[PDB]
């Protein structure tokens, strides 16, 4: 029935087909530029040419889904588009961009060795995405062939708006950024291996950006000898950040919280509310039609025994505005507490949003914090 030992050709066809399918969804539904597609044929072309410059009938390829997302991010980053990894994580964990299947339920029957090579390694959630984009960035070289500078300043904007920080922190963190780097940010972390143990927890540019962001808030707020930032407004900031409200975004972050590996975030789904659960089942019947894989009609009637079944909630800049106002009353050692709880909530949001670990993040901001103390002392 199914191919033997040269279903490399069919494998790469379901893979490439799934890629162009995703591109279709992001130019169409995300209003990308048509140039992206060509940038994708070039990158997928380079690594296709590199795996078909490889001999063995033993396949040795890993075209996991992380490779799809890896060349999408790679191409997007060459094109300097202000999309970041967290956009991709959100997009795929909310079933909008089709992902979590081989040729989703509707196709082809392949050797179960390759269906496993697809379904396996599916998760991006421990930094697998950063590691796979750096791995691809070795597989074909970032430096001469492409421009692997991240879209830094839009990430800063994304970040300040993602909190409710006043726009001064964009320039604050932008400045600490310039202070340690002078704004030079790469994509490879590659020396093909598994092995690494120092220097290289922190050289995916983004993670360092978040690290500078956190640091900035901590330093800045704990050394406003001016007293520009009230002992209270740090609390009011924490509370306007904490109040679970139903916008497209936060609903999304809940949807990502559901498939994040570590507690607490699943205790976070515990502390959600009937409308969150409802819009959840909604997204379940919508985007888990993107499912995977006599008595049959007996189960069509059997399930058809129980029913399958002025705009209320607000937009993003609406919520953003209203918490910006919820703090609009702007104009002693236990304020360090307020600094800490704000930093830890911000951290939480970053951990679920950028699919990394608690320990990963704090490793990075620890390392690069000592990397600022060292070039400051």
């Amino acid at each position: 029935k199914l191919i033997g030992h040269e279903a490399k050709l069919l494998f790469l066809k379901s893979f490439q087909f799934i890629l162009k399918r995703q591109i279709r969804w992001l130019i169409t539904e995300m209003r990308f530029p048509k140039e992206f597609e060509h940038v994708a044929k070039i990158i997928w072309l380079k690594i296709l040419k590199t795996i078909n410059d490889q001999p063995q009938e033993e396949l040795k390829l890993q075209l996991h889904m992380t490779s799809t997302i890896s060349i999408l991010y790679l191409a997007s980053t060459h094109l300097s588009l202000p999309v970041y990894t967290c956009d991709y994580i959100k997009w795929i964990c909310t079933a909008k961009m089709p992902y979590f299947q081989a040729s989703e339920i509707l196709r082809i029957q392949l050797p179960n060795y390759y269906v496993s090579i697809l379904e396996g390694s599916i998760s991006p959630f421990n930094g697998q995405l950063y590691n796979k984009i750096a791995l691809t960035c070795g597989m074909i070289h970032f430096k001469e062939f492409f421009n692997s500078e991240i879209s830094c300043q839009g990430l800063l904007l994304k970040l300040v708006m993602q909190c409710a920080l006043p726009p001064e922190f964009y320039f604050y963190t932008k400045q600490v950024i310039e202070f340690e780097e002078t704004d030079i940010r790469n994509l490879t972390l590659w020396e093909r291996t598994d092995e690494r143990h120092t220097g290289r927890v922190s050289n995916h540019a983004e993670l360092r950006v978040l690290s500078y962001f956190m640091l900035t808030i901590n330093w800045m707020l704990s050394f406003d000898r001016d007293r520009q930032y009230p002992l209270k407004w740090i609390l009011s900031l924490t509370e306007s950040l904490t109040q679970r409200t139903t916008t497209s975004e936060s609903i999304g972050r809940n949807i990502v919280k559901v498939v994040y590996p570590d507690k607490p975030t699943s205790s976070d789904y515990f502390q959600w509310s009937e409308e969150e659960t409802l819009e959840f089942l909604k997204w379940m019947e919508k985007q888990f039609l993107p499912t995977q894989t006599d008595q049959k009609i007996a189960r069509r009637k059997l399930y058809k025994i129980f029913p399958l079944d002025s705009t209320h909630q607000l937009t993003f800049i609406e919520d953003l505005q209203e918490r910006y106002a919820k703090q609009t009353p702007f104009f002693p050692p236990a304020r360090k507490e307020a600094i800490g709880r704000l930093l830890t909530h911000i951290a939480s949001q970053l951990l679920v949003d950028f699919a990394i670990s608690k320990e990963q993040l704090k490793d990075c901001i620890s390392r690069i914090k000592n990397a600022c103390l060292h070039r400051m002392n």
Partner: protein
């Protein structure tokens, strides 16, 4: 923090079950010596027994006296010393975490992390949250939400129906619309009474020998849907229909249908009828009023 209504994500839990029951075999084997594979796990788990209406237990009498200490330090480590190395062989084939689990359960320590707590796949973790919210809402009397949870859940292609008591009490307390708890139950029996392991304790079962909970509960609860009345010859028409002879409880249901229909020579025949089925209900494991009370109602009838 609640049970999940999904088959547990697999590999490592199964190979750990291997290591566990395999070592169990070697220790208990050498233990019987000193007193003188899915299938290895299978035989292993196998040879072992697998004023109000209290379905009483089996209390303490006719059970054998004693034992006096079998196991000193030296004697136990005698039994333990060899099967642990035999274990050293396939431990080399399993994974390092699995090997650690084997080391710790074999020391006697109990693992920190549940199967759920270490589980990992998108769809299954989402089903876990779905089912959880079902159970939570049903606990919270939120029959509306809970109903949405149930419908969205049964939609998913992975869920066979344990969840039926959820919908029985669900549509029961719902009263809202949909062809109701009775309809669901009699559906359950009509679809799953004909040819047409891990997961299974008694509250969901197969129809070789007793499917219990749902059947007896639609039975009684339907007789209470006659408490709505004062339908009966219907209920005992389809209690008449099935052969599953080890019941008697449907004999008392039958005789109760005749006492309820007895509330002129027709009423006589109904009273002689209940008089008959109470003894052909002494057939089996007895449901007893003093039953001279049953007869005393029957003499209040004989008036």
């Amino acid at each position: 923090m609640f049970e999940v209504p999904i088959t547990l994500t697999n590999r490592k839990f199964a190979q750990r079950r291997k290591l566990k029951y395999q070592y169990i075999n070697y220790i208990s084997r050498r233990f019987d010596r000193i007193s003188k594979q899915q299938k290895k796990r299978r035989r292993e788990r196998h040879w072992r027994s697998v004023s109000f209406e209290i379905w009483r237990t089996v209390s303490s009498q006719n059970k054998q006296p004693i034992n006096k200490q079998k196991m000193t330090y030296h004697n136990f480590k005698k039994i333990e010393k060899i099967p642990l190395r035999k274990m050293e062989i396939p431990l080399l084939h399993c994974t390092k975490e699995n090997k650690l689990y084997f080391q710790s359960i074999s020391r006697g320590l109990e693992p920190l992390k549940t199967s759920t707590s270490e589980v990992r796949n998108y769809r299954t973790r989402h089903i876990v949250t779905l089912t959880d919210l079902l159970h939570l809402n049903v606990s919270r009397h939120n029959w509306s939400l809970a109903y949405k949870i149930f419908a969205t859940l049964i939609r998913i292609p992975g869920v066979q129906i344990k969840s039926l008591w959820g919908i029985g009490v669900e549509i029961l307390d719902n009263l809202s619309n949909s062809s109701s708890g009775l309809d669901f139950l009699q559906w359950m029996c009509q679809i799953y009474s004909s040819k047409s392991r891990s997961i299974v304790p008694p509250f969901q079962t197969g129809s070789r020998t007793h499917t219990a909970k749902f059947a007896i509960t639609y039975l009684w609860s339907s007789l209470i849907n006659c408490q709505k009345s004062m339908l009966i010859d219907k209920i005992s028409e389809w209690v008449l229909t099935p052969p599953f002879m080890e019941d008697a409880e449907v004999w008392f249901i039958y005789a109760s249908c005749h006492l309820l229909k007895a509330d002129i020579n027709q009423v006589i025949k109904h009273i002689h009828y209940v008089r008959t089925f109470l003894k052909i209900c002494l057939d089996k494991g007895g449901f007893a009023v003093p039953s001279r009370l049953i007869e005393n109602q029957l003499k209040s009838f004989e008036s």
